[PDB]
């Protein structure tokens, strides 16, 4: 498996434009780019409002936050059975692949993944707050 490379010269779905598009954050902080492969032309619903028409083949779109890209990904997977993927793009031109992280969707187990933020105990086995008091900052009893 290999990490995909963002192609900026990728056709985009035919949309007339809306007011729920990108804002100054896309030029000052970061934005997201969702790409997918469509087998045929089809009218889909935009996460920011309106109905667009996805073209046959590659399709690229820009969104303000990751939630919009994952919402469109879920819509394309559950309504048209596609395989979309998205990146986070910075104003300096840096592209960072986000989902799927390993090329395999996270609902199914995949080899090579390492569990993080996992507590090898239960909720009732957590310590009292008095034991985590007077720390460097506000620490919850579940953070340890």
Partner 1 sequence: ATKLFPKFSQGLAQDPTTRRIWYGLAMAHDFESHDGMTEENLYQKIFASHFGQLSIIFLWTSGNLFHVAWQGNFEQWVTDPVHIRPIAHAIWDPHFGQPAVEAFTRGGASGPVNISTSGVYQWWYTIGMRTNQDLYVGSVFLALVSAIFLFAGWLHLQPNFQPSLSWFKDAESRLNHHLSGLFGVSSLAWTGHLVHVAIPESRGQHVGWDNFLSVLPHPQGLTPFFTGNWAAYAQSPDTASHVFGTAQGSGQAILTFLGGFHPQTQSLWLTDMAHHHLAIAVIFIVAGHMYRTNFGIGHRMQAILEAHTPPSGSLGAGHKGLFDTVNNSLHFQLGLALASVGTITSLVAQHMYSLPPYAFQAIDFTTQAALYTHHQYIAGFIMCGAFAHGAIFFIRDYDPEQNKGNVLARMLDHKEALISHLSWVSLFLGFHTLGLYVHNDVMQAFGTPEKQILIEPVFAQWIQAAHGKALYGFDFLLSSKTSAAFANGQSLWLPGWLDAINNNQNSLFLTIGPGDFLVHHAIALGLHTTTLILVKGALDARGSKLMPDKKDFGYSFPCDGPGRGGTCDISAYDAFYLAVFWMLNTIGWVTFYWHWKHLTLWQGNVAQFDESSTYLMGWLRDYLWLNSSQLINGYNPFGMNSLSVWAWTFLFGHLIYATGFMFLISWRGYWQELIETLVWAHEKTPLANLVYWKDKPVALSIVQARLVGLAHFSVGYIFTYAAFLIASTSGRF
Partner 2 sequence: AHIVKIYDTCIGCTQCVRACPLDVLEMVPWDGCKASQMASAPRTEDCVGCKRCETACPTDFLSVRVYLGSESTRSMGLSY
Partner 3 sequence: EVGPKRGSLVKILRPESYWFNQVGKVVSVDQSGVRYPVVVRFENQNYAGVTTNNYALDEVVAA
Residues that bind partner 1 (CB under 8 A): 19-20, 23-24, 123-124, 126, 128-130, 133-134, 136-138, 140-142
123: contact with partner 3 by CB under 8 A: yes
Cβ contact 13:52 at 8 Å: yes
Distance CA(120)–CA(76), nearest Å, equals 36
- Per DSSP, 62 falls in state E
Tell me the DSSP string of 76-104. Answer: HHHHH----EEEEE-TTS-EEEEESSSSS
94: contact with partner 2 by CB under 8 A: no
* CB of 3 vs partner 1, minimal distance in Å: 30
The interface mask with partner 3, positions 83-122, x = CB under 8 A, is ---------------------------------------x
């Amino acid at each position: 498996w290999t990490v995909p490379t963002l192609n900026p010269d990728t056709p985009s779905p035919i949309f007339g434009g809306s007011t729920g598009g990108l804002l100054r954050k896309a030029q000052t902080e970061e934005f997201y780019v969702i790409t997918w492969e469509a087998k045929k032309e089809q009218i889909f619903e935009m996460p920011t409002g309106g109905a667009a028409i996805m073209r046959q083949g590659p399709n690229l779109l820009k969104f303000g936050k990751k939630e919009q890209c994952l919402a469109l990904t879920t819509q394309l997977r559950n309504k048209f059975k596609l395989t979309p993927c998205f990146y986070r793009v910075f104003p300096d031109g840096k592209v960072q692949y986000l989902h799927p992280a390993d090329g395999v969707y996270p609902e199914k187990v995949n080899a090579g993944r390492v569990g993080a933020n996992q507590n090898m105990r239960r909720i009732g086995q957590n310590v009292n707050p008095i034991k985590v008091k007077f720390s460097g900052r506000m620490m919850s009893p579940a953070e340890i």
